[PDB]
Coordinates of C-alpha atoms and ligand atoms in Angstrom, one line a residue:
Chain L
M1 CA 78.2 93.9 67.5
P2 CA 81.8 92.2 66.9
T3 CA 83.8 90.7 69.7
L4 CA 86.9 90.7 71.5
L5 CA 89.3 88.1 73.1
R6 CA 91.8 89.1 75.5
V7 CA 94.3 86.7 76.8
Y8 CA 97.4 87.6 79.3
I9 CA 100.0 84.9 79.2
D10 CA 101.5 85.6 82.8
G11 CA 103.7 83.6 85.6
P12 CA 107.4 83.6 86.3
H13 CA 109.7 84.2 83.6
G14 CA 111.8 81.6 82.0
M15 CA 108.9 79.3 81.5
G16 CA 108.6 79.9 77.7
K17 CA 105.7 82.0 77.5
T18 CA 107.2 84.5 75.1
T19 CA 108.0 82.0 72.7
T20 CA 105.0 80.0 73.3
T21 CA 103.0 83.1 72.4
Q22 CA 104.8 84.1 69.3
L23 CA 104.3 80.6 68.1
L24 CA 100.7 80.9 68.7
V25 CA 100.1 84.5 67.0
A26 CA 102.0 83.1 64.0
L27 CA 99.4 80.6 63.2
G28 CA 96.7 83.3 63.2
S29 CA 95.5 85.2 60.5
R30 CA 97.1 88.9 59.8
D31 CA 94.4 90.8 60.9
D32 CA 92.5 88.8 63.5
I33 CA 95.1 88.1 66.2
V34 CA 97.6 90.8 67.5
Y35 CA 100.4 90.4 70.1
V36 CA 101.4 93.1 72.7
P37 CA 104.7 92.0 73.4
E38 CA 107.1 92.1 76.0
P39 CA 108.4 95.8 76.2
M40 CA 112.5 95.0 76.7
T41 CA 113.1 98.2 74.9
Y42 CA 111.5 100.4 77.4
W43 CA 113.1 98.4 80.2
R44 CA 116.7 98.7 78.8
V45 CA 116.5 102.1 77.1
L46 CA 113.5 104.4 76.9
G47 CA 112.2 103.9 80.6
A48 CA 115.8 104.1 82.2
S49 CA 119.2 102.2 82.0
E50 CA 119.1 98.4 82.0
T51 CA 116.4 98.2 84.9
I52 CA 116.7 94.6 84.9
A53 CA 120.4 94.7 85.5
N54 CA 119.8 97.4 88.1
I55 CA 117.3 95.1 90.1
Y56 CA 119.6 91.9 90.4
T57 CA 122.7 94.2 91.2
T58 CA 121.0 95.6 94.2
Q59 CA 119.3 92.4 95.7
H60 CA 122.8 90.8 95.4
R61 CA 124.3 93.5 97.2
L62 CA 121.5 93.3 99.9
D63 CA 122.4 89.8 100.4
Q64 CA 125.8 90.1 100.2
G65 CA 125.6 92.7 103.1
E66 CA 126.6 95.5 101.1
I67 CA 123.8 97.9 101.7
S68 CA 120.6 97.9 104.0
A69 CA 116.9 96.6 103.7
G70 CA 115.9 100.3 103.5
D71 CA 118.4 101.2 100.8
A72 CA 117.6 98.3 98.8
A73 CA 113.7 98.9 99.4
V74 CA 114.0 102.4 97.6
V75 CA 115.9 101.0 94.5
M76 CA 113.4 98.0 94.3
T77 CA 110.3 100.4 94.5
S78 CA 111.7 103.0 91.7
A79 CA 112.7 100.2 89.3
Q80 CA 109.4 98.3 89.7
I81 CA 107.0 101.3 88.9
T82 CA 109.1 101.9 85.9
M83 CA 109.2 98.1 84.8
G84 CA 105.4 98.2 84.9
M85 CA 104.5 101.5 83.0
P86 CA 103.8 99.9 79.6
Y87 CA 101.1 97.3 81.0
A88 CA 99.5 100.3 82.9
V89 CA 99.2 102.8 79.7
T90 CA 98.1 100.0 77.8
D91 CA 95.3 98.7 79.8
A92 CA 94.3 102.4 80.4
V93 CA 93.9 103.2 76.9
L94 CA 92.1 100.0 76.2
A95 CA 89.7 100.2 78.8
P96 CA 87.2 102.4 77.1
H97 CA 86.8 99.8 74.1
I98 CA 85.7 96.9 76.2
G99 CA 82.2 96.0 76.8
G100 CA 80.2 93.4 78.4
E101 CA 81.0 89.7 78.4
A102 CA 80.0 87.8 75.4
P103 CA 81.2 81.8 68.1
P104 CA 84.8 83.2 66.8
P105 CA 85.9 86.3 68.0
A106 CA 86.3 89.3 65.5
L107 CA 89.6 90.1 66.8
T108 CA 92.1 88.2 69.5
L109 CA 94.4 90.3 71.8
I110 CA 97.2 88.4 73.2
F111 CA 99.4 90.1 75.8
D112 CA 102.9 89.3 77.5
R113 CA 102.0 89.7 81.1
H114 CA 99.0 91.4 82.8
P115 CA 99.5 94.8 85.2
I116 CA 99.3 92.4 88.1
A117 CA 102.7 91.0 87.3
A118 CA 104.4 94.3 88.2
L119 CA 101.6 96.0 90.7
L120 CA 101.7 92.9 92.6
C121 CA 103.5 89.8 92.0
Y122 CA 107.1 90.8 91.4
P123 CA 106.6 93.5 94.4
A124 CA 105.3 90.5 96.3
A125 CA 108.3 88.4 95.7
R126 CA 110.8 91.2 96.4
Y127 CA 109.0 91.5 99.9
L128 CA 109.8 87.6 100.4
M129 CA 113.3 88.3 99.5
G130 CA 113.6 91.1 102.1
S131 CA 114.1 94.0 99.6
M132 CA 110.8 95.6 99.6
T133 CA 108.2 96.7 102.6
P134 CA 104.8 95.2 102.8
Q135 CA 103.4 99.0 103.1
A136 CA 105.0 99.5 99.6
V137 CA 103.6 96.3 98.1
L138 CA 100.2 97.4 99.2
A139 CA 100.6 100.8 97.6
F140 CA 101.2 99.0 94.4
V141 CA 98.1 96.6 95.0
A142 CA 96.3 99.8 95.6
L143 CA 96.9 101.1 92.2
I144 CA 95.7 98.0 90.4
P145 CA 93.5 99.1 87.5
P146 CA 90.0 98.0 87.5
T147 CA 89.5 94.5 86.0
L148 CA 87.9 94.7 82.7
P149 CA 85.2 92.2 81.3
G150 CA 86.8 89.1 79.8
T151 CA 90.2 89.2 81.7
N152 CA 91.5 85.7 80.8
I153 CA 95.0 85.1 82.7
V154 CA 97.3 82.2 81.8
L155 CA 99.9 81.2 84.2
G156 CA 102.6 78.5 84.0
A157 CA 103.2 75.1 85.4
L158 CA 106.6 73.5 85.3
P159 CA 108.7 71.5 87.8
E160 CA 111.3 73.5 89.8
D161 CA 114.2 71.4 88.7
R162 CA 113.4 71.6 85.1
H163 CA 112.5 75.5 85.4
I164 CA 116.1 76.1 87.1
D165 CA 117.6 74.4 84.1
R166 CA 115.5 76.1 81.8
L167 CA 116.2 79.7 83.4
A168 CA 119.8 79.0 83.8
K169 CA 119.8 79.1 80.0
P170 CA 118.5 91.7 80.5
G171 CA 121.1 91.7 83.2
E172 CA 120.0 89.1 85.2
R173 CA 121.9 86.9 87.6
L174 CA 120.9 83.3 88.7
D175 CA 118.9 84.1 91.7
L176 CA 117.4 80.6 92.8
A177 CA 116.2 82.4 96.1
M178 CA 114.3 84.7 93.8
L179 CA 112.8 81.9 91.3
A180 CA 111.6 80.1 94.5
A181 CA 110.0 83.4 95.6
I182 CA 108.4 84.1 92.4
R183 CA 107.1 80.6 92.0
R184 CA 105.5 80.8 95.3
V185 CA 103.8 84.0 94.7
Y186 CA 102.1 83.0 91.1
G187 CA 101.0 80.0 93.3
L188 CA 99.6 81.8 95.8
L189 CA 97.7 83.9 93.2
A190 CA 96.2 81.2 91.5
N191 CA 94.8 79.9 94.7
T192 CA 93.4 83.4 95.6
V193 CA 91.4 83.7 92.4
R194 CA 90.1 80.1 93.4
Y195 CA 89.4 81.0 97.0
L196 CA 87.6 84.2 96.0
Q197 CA 85.5 82.4 93.4
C198 CA 84.7 80.0 95.6
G199 CA 82.9 82.8 97.6
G200 CA 86.0 83.3 100.1
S201 CA 86.2 86.2 102.4
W202 CA 89.5 87.2 103.9
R203 CA 88.0 89.2 106.8
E204 CA 85.9 86.2 107.9
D205 CA 89.1 83.9 107.6
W206 CA 91.8 86.3 108.8
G207 CA 92.1 84.7 112.1
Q208 CA 92.6 81.3 110.7
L209 CA 96.1 82.7 109.7
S210 CA 98.9 82.1 112.2
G211 CA 101.8 79.7 113.1
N212 CA 88.8 77.5 87.4
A213 CA 89.3 74.2 88.9
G214 CA 88.9 72.5 92.0
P215 CA 87.8 73.1 95.7
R216 CA 88.2 76.5 97.7
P217 CA 91.7 76.7 99.1
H218 CA 92.8 77.5 102.7
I219 CA 93.1 81.4 103.3
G220 CA 96.6 80.3 104.2
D221 CA 97.3 79.1 100.8
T222 CA 96.5 82.6 99.2
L223 CA 98.3 85.8 98.7
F224 CA 96.4 87.2 101.8
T225 CA 98.9 85.3 104.0
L226 CA 101.8 87.5 103.1
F227 CA 100.4 90.6 104.8
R228 CA 100.2 89.3 108.1
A229 CA 103.7 91.1 109.1
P230 CA 104.1 93.0 112.0
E231 CA 104.7 96.2 110.0
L232 CA 101.0 96.3 109.1
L233 CA 99.5 95.0 112.6
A234 CA 98.3 97.4 114.9
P235 CA 99.0 97.0 118.7
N236 CA 95.5 95.3 119.3
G237 CA 97.0 92.6 116.7
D238 CA 94.7 93.7 114.1
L239 CA 95.5 95.1 110.3
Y240 CA 95.5 99.0 110.3
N241 CA 92.3 99.6 108.6
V242 CA 94.4 101.4 105.5
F243 CA 95.8 98.1 104.9
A244 CA 92.8 96.0 105.0
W245 CA 91.3 98.3 102.6
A246 CA 94.1 97.5 100.2
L247 CA 93.2 93.7 100.7
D248 CA 89.7 94.7 99.9
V249 CA 91.1 95.9 96.6
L250 CA 93.2 93.1 96.0
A251 CA 90.0 91.0 96.3
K252 CA 87.8 93.0 94.2
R253 CA 90.6 92.9 91.5
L254 CA 91.3 89.3 91.7
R255 CA 87.6 87.6 92.2
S256 CA 86.6 88.7 88.6
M257 CA 89.4 87.1 86.9
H258 CA 89.4 83.8 84.8
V259 CA 92.4 82.1 85.4
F260 CA 93.8 79.4 83.3
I261 CA 97.0 77.0 83.8
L262 CA 99.2 75.9 81.1
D263 CA 101.8 73.2 81.4
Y264 CA 105.5 74.3 80.3
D265 CA 106.9 70.9 80.7
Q266 CA 106.9 70.1 77.0
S267 CA 108.3 71.3 73.5
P268 CA 107.6 74.8 72.1
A269 CA 105.0 73.6 69.5
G270 CA 103.5 71.5 72.7
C271 CA 103.2 74.7 74.5
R272 CA 101.4 76.5 71.6
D273 CA 98.8 73.7 70.8
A274 CA 97.9 73.3 74.4
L275 CA 97.4 77.2 74.8
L276 CA 95.2 77.0 71.5
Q277 CA 93.1 74.4 72.9
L278 CA 92.6 76.4 76.1
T279 CA 91.5 79.4 74.3
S280 CA 88.2 77.8 73.4
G281 CA 87.0 78.1 77.2
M282 CA 87.6 81.6 77.4
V283 CA 85.6 84.7 78.2
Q284 CA 85.1 86.9 75.1
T285 CA 83.6 90.4 75.0
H286 CA 81.7 93.0 72.8
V287 CA 83.5 96.2 71.9
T288 CA 81.8 99.4 72.7
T289 CA 81.9 100.8 69.1
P290 CA 82.4 99.4 65.6
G291 CA 85.6 100.9 64.9
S292 CA 87.2 99.6 68.4
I293 CA 88.4 96.5 66.2
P294 CA 90.8 98.4 64.0
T295 CA 91.6 101.1 66.6
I296 CA 92.5 98.4 69.2
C297 CA 94.5 96.8 66.2
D298 CA 96.6 99.6 65.6
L299 CA 97.4 100.4 69.2
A300 CA 98.6 96.9 69.5
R301 CA 100.8 96.8 66.4
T302 CA 101.9 100.5 67.4
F303 CA 103.2 98.9 70.7
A304 CA 105.0 96.1 69.1
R305 CA 106.8 98.3 66.6
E306 CA 108.3 100.3 69.3
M307 CA 108.8 98.3 72.3
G308 CA 109.1 94.4 71.4
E309 CA 112.5 93.1 71.2
Chain X
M1 CA 68.8 106.4 95.0
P2 CA 70.3 109.0 97.4
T3 CA 72.6 111.6 96.3
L4 CA 76.2 112.5 97.1
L5 CA 78.5 115.2 96.8
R6 CA 82.0 114.9 96.6
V7 CA 84.5 117.9 97.2
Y8 CA 88.2 117.2 97.1
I9 CA 90.1 120.2 98.7
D10 CA 93.3 120.4 96.8
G11 CA 95.8 122.9 95.1
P12 CA 99.4 123.7 96.5
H13 CA 99.7 123.4 100.1
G14 CA 100.6 126.3 102.6
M15 CA 97.5 128.5 101.2
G16 CA 95.1 127.9 103.9
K17 CA 93.6 124.3 102.8
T18 CA 93.1 122.7 106.3
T19 CA 92.2 125.5 108.5
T20 CA 89.6 126.4 106.0
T21 CA 88.0 123.2 105.7
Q22 CA 87.8 122.6 109.5
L23 CA 85.6 125.6 109.9
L24 CA 83.3 124.3 107.3
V25 CA 82.6 120.8 109.0
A26 CA 81.9 123.1 111.8
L27 CA 79.0 124.6 110.4
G28 CA 77.3 121.7 109.1
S29 CA 75.8 118.7 110.8
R30 CA 78.4 115.9 112.2
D31 CA 76.0 113.7 110.3
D32 CA 75.1 115.4 107.0
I33 CA 78.9 116.2 106.0
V34 CA 81.9 114.2 106.7
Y35 CA 85.7 115.0 106.4
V36 CA 88.5 112.8 105.2
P37 CA 91.5 114.7 106.7
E38 CA 95.2 114.9 105.9
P39 CA 96.7 111.4 106.5
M40 CA 99.8 112.7 108.6
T41 CA 100.1 109.3 110.7
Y42 CA 100.3 107.4 107.7
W43 CA 103.1 109.7 106.2
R44 CA 104.9 109.7 109.6
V45 CA 104.7 106.4 111.0
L46 CA 102.4 103.8 109.2
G47 CA 103.8 103.6 105.8
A48 CA 107.3 104.5 106.6
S49 CA 109.1 106.9 108.9
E50 CA 109.0 110.6 108.6
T51 CA 108.1 110.6 105.0
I52 CA 108.1 114.2 104.4
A53 CA 111.5 114.7 106.1
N54 CA 113.0 112.0 103.6
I55 CA 111.5 113.9 100.9
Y56 CA 112.7 117.5 101.8
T57 CA 116.2 116.3 103.0
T58 CA 116.7 114.3 99.8
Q59 CA 116.2 117.4 97.8
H60 CA 118.4 119.4 99.9
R61 CA 121.0 116.8 99.5
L62 CA 120.9 117.0 95.8
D63 CA 120.9 121.0 96.1
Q64 CA 124.0 120.8 98.2
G65 CA 125.5 118.5 95.6
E66 CA 126.1 115.9 98.1
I67 CA 124.1 113.2 96.2
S68 CA 123.4 112.5 92.5
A69 CA 120.3 113.4 90.6
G70 CA 120.0 109.6 90.0
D71 CA 120.0 108.9 93.6
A72 CA 117.7 111.7 94.5
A73 CA 115.2 110.6 91.8
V74 CA 115.0 107.0 93.3
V75 CA 114.1 108.1 96.7
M76 CA 112.0 110.8 95.3
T77 CA 109.8 108.0 93.7
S78 CA 109.9 105.8 96.4
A79 CA 108.9 108.4 98.9
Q80 CA 106.1 109.7 97.0
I81 CA 104.2 106.3 96.5
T82 CA 104.2 106.3 100.3
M83 CA 102.5 109.9 100.3
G84 CA 100.1 108.6 98.0
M85 CA 98.8 105.6 99.2
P86 CA 96.2 106.7 101.2
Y87 CA 94.4 108.7 98.7
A88 CA 94.9 106.0 96.4
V89 CA 93.3 103.2 98.5
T90 CA 90.5 105.6 99.4
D91 CA 89.5 106.2 95.9
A92 CA 89.6 102.5 95.1
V93 CA 87.3 101.4 97.8
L94 CA 85.0 104.5 97.2
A95 CA 84.4 103.9 93.4
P96 CA 81.6 100.9 93.4
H97 CA 79.7 103.1 95.6
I98 CA 79.5 106.2 93.3
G99 CA 76.6 106.1 90.4
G100 CA 75.7 108.6 87.7
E101 CA 75.1 112.2 87.9
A102 CA 72.1 113.7 89.9
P103 CA 68.2 119.9 95.6
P104 CA 70.5 119.6 98.6
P105 CA 72.6 116.2 98.8
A106 CA 72.0 113.4 101.2
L107 CA 75.6 113.4 102.1
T108 CA 78.7 115.6 101.4
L109 CA 82.2 114.1 101.4
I110 CA 84.9 116.5 101.7
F111 CA 88.5 115.0 101.2
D112 CA 92.0 116.6 102.1
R113 CA 93.1 116.2 98.5
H114 CA 92.5 114.3 95.7
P115 CA 94.7 111.4 94.2
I116 CA 96.2 113.4 91.3
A117 CA 98.0 115.6 94.0
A118 CA 100.3 112.6 94.8
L119 CA 100.3 110.9 91.2
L120 CA 100.7 114.1 89.1
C121 CA 101.2 117.6 90.7
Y122 CA 103.6 116.7 93.3
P123 CA 106.1 114.4 91.2
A124 CA 105.8 117.0 88.4
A125 CA 106.9 119.6 90.9
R126 CA 109.8 117.6 91.9
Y127 CA 110.6 116.8 88.2
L128 CA 111.0 120.8 87.7
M129 CA 113.3 120.6 90.7
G130 CA 115.5 118.1 89.1
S131 CA 114.8 115.2 91.6
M132 CA 112.5 113.1 89.4
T133 CA 112.6 111.7 86.0
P134 CA 109.9 112.4 83.4
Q135 CA 109.3 109.0 82.8
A136 CA 108.6 108.2 86.6
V137 CA 106.0 111.2 86.5
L138 CA 104.7 109.5 83.5
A139 CA 104.4 106.1 85.1
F140 CA 102.3 107.6 88.1
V141 CA 100.3 109.6 85.4
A142 CA 99.3 106.1 84.1
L143 CA 97.8 104.9 87.3
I144 CA 95.6 107.8 87.7
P145 CA 92.1 106.3 88.7
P146 CA 89.4 106.9 86.2
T147 CA 87.4 110.1 86.9
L148 CA 84.3 109.2 88.3
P149 CA 81.1 111.3 87.7
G150 CA 81.1 114.5 90.1
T151 CA 84.6 114.7 90.7
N152 CA 84.7 118.2 92.2
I153 CA 88.2 119.6 92.6
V154 CA 89.0 123.1 94.5
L155 CA 91.9 124.8 93.7
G156 CA 93.5 127.8 95.2
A157 CA 94.3 131.3 94.5
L158 CA 96.8 133.5 96.5
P159 CA 99.4 135.9 95.5
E160 CA 102.8 134.5 95.9
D161 CA 103.9 136.8 98.9
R162 CA 100.9 135.9 100.9
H163 CA 101.5 132.3 100.3
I164 CA 105.3 132.2 101.1
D165 CA 104.0 133.9 104.5
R166 CA 101.2 131.5 105.2
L167 CA 103.6 128.7 104.2
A168 CA 106.2 129.8 106.5
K169 CA 103.8 130.2 109.5
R170 CA 102.8 126.4 109.1
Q171 CA 105.6 124.0 108.1
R172 CA 104.8 120.5 108.7
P173 CA 107.5 117.8 110.5
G174 CA 110.4 117.6 108.4
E175 CA 109.6 120.1 106.0
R176 CA 112.0 122.6 104.8
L177 CA 110.9 126.1 103.5
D178 CA 111.9 126.1 100.0
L179 CA 111.0 128.9 97.5
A180 CA 112.1 127.0 94.7
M181 CA 109.7 124.1 95.6
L182 CA 107.1 126.7 96.2
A183 CA 107.4 128.1 92.8
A184 CA 107.7 124.7 91.3
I185 CA 104.3 123.6 93.0
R186 CA 102.4 126.7 92.3
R187 CA 103.2 126.7 88.8
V188 CA 102.2 122.9 88.3
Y189 CA 98.9 123.9 89.7
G190 CA 98.3 126.7 87.6
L191 CA 99.3 124.6 84.5
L192 CA 96.7 122.0 85.9
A193 CA 93.9 124.7 85.9
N194 CA 94.7 125.8 82.2
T195 CA 95.2 122.3 81.2
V196 CA 91.5 121.3 82.4
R197 CA 90.1 124.3 80.4
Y198 CA 92.2 123.6 77.1
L199 CA 90.9 120.4 77.5
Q200 CA 87.1 121.3 78.2
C201 CA 87.0 123.7 75.0
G202 CA 88.2 121.1 72.8
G203 CA 92.0 121.2 72.9
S204 CA 94.0 118.1 71.3
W205 CA 97.4 117.8 72.5
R206 CA 98.2 115.6 69.4
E207 CA 97.2 118.5 67.3
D208 CA 98.7 121.5 69.0
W209 CA 102.1 119.5 69.7
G210 CA 103.6 121.1 66.7
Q211 CA 103.1 124.6 68.7
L212 CA 105.8 123.5 71.0
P213 CA 89.2 130.5 72.4
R214 CA 91.3 128.5 75.1
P215 CA 94.7 128.5 76.6
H216 CA 97.9 127.8 74.6
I217 CA 99.1 124.3 74.8
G218 CA 102.7 126.3 76.1
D219 CA 100.7 127.1 79.0
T220 CA 99.2 123.5 79.9
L221 CA 101.0 120.6 81.7
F222 CA 101.3 119.3 78.3
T223 CA 104.4 121.4 77.8
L224 CA 106.4 119.9 80.8
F225 CA 106.7 116.8 78.5
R226 CA 108.6 117.9 75.7
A227 CA 111.4 116.7 77.6
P228 CA 114.6 115.1 76.2
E229 CA 114.1 111.7 77.6
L230 CA 110.8 111.0 76.4
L231 CA 111.6 111.9 72.6
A232 CA 113.0 109.6 69.5
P233 CA 116.0 111.0 67.4
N234 CA 113.3 112.6 65.0
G235 CA 111.5 114.6 67.8
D236 CA 108.6 112.6 68.2
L237 CA 107.3 111.3 71.8
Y238 CA 107.4 107.7 71.7
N239 CA 104.2 105.8 71.6
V240 CA 104.1 104.8 74.8
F241 CA 104.7 108.3 76.6
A242 CA 101.9 109.6 74.1
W243 CA 99.4 107.3 75.5
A244 CA 100.2 108.3 78.8
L245 CA 99.5 112.0 77.8
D246 CA 96.2 110.6 76.2
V247 CA 95.4 109.2 79.8
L248 CA 96.2 112.5 81.4
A249 CA 93.9 113.9 78.9
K250 CA 91.1 111.7 79.5
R251 CA 91.2 112.0 83.5
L252 CA 91.7 115.9 83.7
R253 CA 89.2 116.7 81.1
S254 CA 86.1 115.5 83.0
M255 CA 87.0 117.0 86.3
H256 CA 85.3 119.9 87.4
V257 CA 87.3 122.8 89.1
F258 CA 86.4 125.6 91.3
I259 CA 89.1 128.0 92.3
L260 CA 88.9 129.2 96.0
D261 CA 90.3 132.7 97.1
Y262 CA 92.4 132.1 99.9
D263 CA 93.5 136.0 100.3
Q264 CA 90.9 136.4 103.2
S265 CA 90.3 135.6 106.6
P266 CA 89.9 131.5 107.4
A267 CA 86.2 132.4 107.9
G268 CA 86.2 134.3 104.5
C269 CA 87.6 131.1 102.9
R270 CA 85.1 128.9 104.9
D271 CA 81.9 131.0 103.3
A272 CA 83.5 131.2 99.9
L273 CA 84.0 127.6 99.8
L274 CA 80.5 126.9 101.0
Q275 CA 79.0 129.2 98.1
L276 CA 81.2 127.3 95.6
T277 CA 79.3 124.3 96.1
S278 CA 76.1 125.4 94.4
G279 CA 77.7 124.9 91.1
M280 CA 79.4 121.2 91.9
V281 CA 78.3 118.3 90.3
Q282 CA 76.4 115.6 92.6
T283 CA 75.9 111.9 91.9
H284 CA 73.5 108.9 93.0
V285 CA 74.9 106.3 95.3
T286 CA 74.8 102.7 94.1
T287 CA 73.2 101.1 97.2
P288 CA 71.1 101.8 100.0
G289 CA 73.8 101.2 102.3
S290 CA 76.5 103.0 100.6
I291 CA 75.6 106.2 102.7
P292 CA 76.6 104.7 106.0
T293 CA 79.5 102.7 104.6
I294 CA 80.9 105.8 103.3
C295 CA 80.5 107.8 106.7
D296 CA 82.1 104.9 108.5
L297 CA 85.1 104.7 106.1
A298 CA 85.6 108.4 106.6
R299 CA 85.3 108.6 110.5
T300 CA 87.8 105.3 110.2
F301 CA 90.2 106.9 108.1
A302 CA 90.2 110.1 110.1
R303 CA 90.3 108.1 113.5
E304 CA 93.4 106.1 112.1
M305 CA 95.5 108.7 110.0
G306 CA 94.3 111.9 111.3
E307 CA 97.0 113.9 113.4
Ligands
N50_1 C1 112.9 91.2 87.5 O1 112.1 92.4 88.0 C2 110.7 92.4 87.4 N1 110.7 91.5 86.1 C3 109.4 91.3 85.8 C4 109.4 90.4 84.6 C5 110.3 90.3 83.5 C6 111.8 90.1 83.9 O2 112.0 89.3 84.8 C7 109.7 89.6 82.0 O3 110.2 88.5 82.2 C8 108.5 92.5 86.0 C9 107.3 92.4 85.4 C10 108.9 92.9 87.1 O4 107.6 93.9 87.6 C11 108.0 95.0 88.7 N2 109.8 93.0 87.8
N50_2 C1 106.0 117.3 100.7 O1 105.9 116.1 99.5 C2 104.4 115.9 99.0 N1 103.5 116.4 100.0 C3 102.2 116.1 99.5 C4 101.2 117.0 100.4 C5 101.4 117.7 101.4 C6 102.1 118.5 102.0 O2 103.3 117.7 102.3 C7 100.0 117.9 102.2 O3 99.6 119.2 101.7 C8 101.9 115.3 98.5 C9 100.4 115.0 98.4 C10 103.0 114.7 98.0 O4 102.6 113.9 97.0 C11 103.6 112.9 96.3 N2 104.5 114.9 98.0

């Protein structure tokens, strides 16, 4: 029974994730490590017209006082559903091939981002920016697919000052406020997994909210803190049950994830070797049939050819 | 482990779907069959303000030429997320309580609609109405939750004329009587039923794609996706959309469809639905506390998001 290692490189854009990944795939053998790359093609052409460009234009207009929140919200919600579609189909066709958690893997699968990037992280950041409702953020949360065994997610670390300079180097605009928001979000996320793996329970700690490594963070330091918003609160001050249930889904999805932190404050070859060492402590899985491996290989290869830049 | 029967009452709206169900929960014991009703309060207040009204005003403005198809699509996409949220959250918290396939069940759970109504059927109809992109529809399709065992879906049969009449007699808040939408939504559901049969008799969309004892691929939902937006310059579907179609195939193939004839009295419908249950597939729950956890979920849902 052959084995599989899946690794999702995620976190805020502009750190160097894409390069580092490509650098890592390059060191490997042709037929034992594949890359599912960033689907910019879907973003700029196939899915719609310059989705990246559309998003930053609308945020800028909202800030400039040129459209209202409600208007910006519907534009952001649409574009983001679109942004995330390739991650979602990929997860869906792959799911049946994944077995139980399990010596060198017969195949390593590297992903540019994980479904929560588009179904949770960026939405949450847009909400912080005032360009998306928390209800819609939670509707995205409710559609996060089941976390499969051996979900290794690598997030980035990088000083803000250096992050600002590197990013200043699609259709994007330099939105420091966005950068700050997405940085905060991925920060809460890493805390949240830690919070949940240390047996934390958002229901039991909900009142404490108001005005891989380490100890259990405070609930105020996790994603749960974002959804203490008046839109989601009943008169009695509690969360409406429907929203509570989506927080439950959030906990169920995150708690079983293996989070790793990668330092991007170094050269491109540095990040690569850092990442390589980091893989040996990652959870592998068995596949479900013998032919899962070449099948998985074709899908990843098919994807890159079509959607990678 | 104790057994569970899940029954999703679905199909196009305006046929009798709600009245019918209400008569059935009346018959069975209040603590032997539970009901998850239409989340009108979420659609009208909690998720956003008057979502139904927003949907229909927007189609109308697109029809009157007051806004662009592009503008319509974004609003439509956004609002349909809002419509589907309670369905999606419910399935997600219920899933771990569902076990394998299984004598009368320990609990019978009846829903007003299944998640594919908001993630496939309604969006597809809006696509036929020019107010949603086919990409968006496929993006919803990709997010369809996995099909758990015992997924029994009841769809309705009713001649269009009777259907028009009943829908006219019970519009929802903000809804606009629209015969194009009605024909769009009826067709989507007819294709749905045909799609399941096609799949279940071993149809393979990839094989029969060229053609664009089972239905013809041209009478399934796969025909809706020959759209030019999804095709490469040589006529092939991009692989990304092809995979969404594999997902659609996997999800639909293992659902169990039952057709309810609505062309009768509300009490006739109730009896019919009841007899329809002998062929439905039961499952085991997964934990001794699943049954009461499910009951409390249902009543909590009803209490909060019911009208
Ligand atoms: C910029 O908006 C936005 N960016 C991304 C990520 C990008 C481009 O910012 C890949 O770097 C994602 C995943 C997203 O998901 C909804 N939304
Ligand atoms: C009217 O628009 C619309 N209605 C429905 C269903 C209704 C009728 O408004 C309840 O039958 C659904 C599920 C939906 O899903 C996106 N969109």
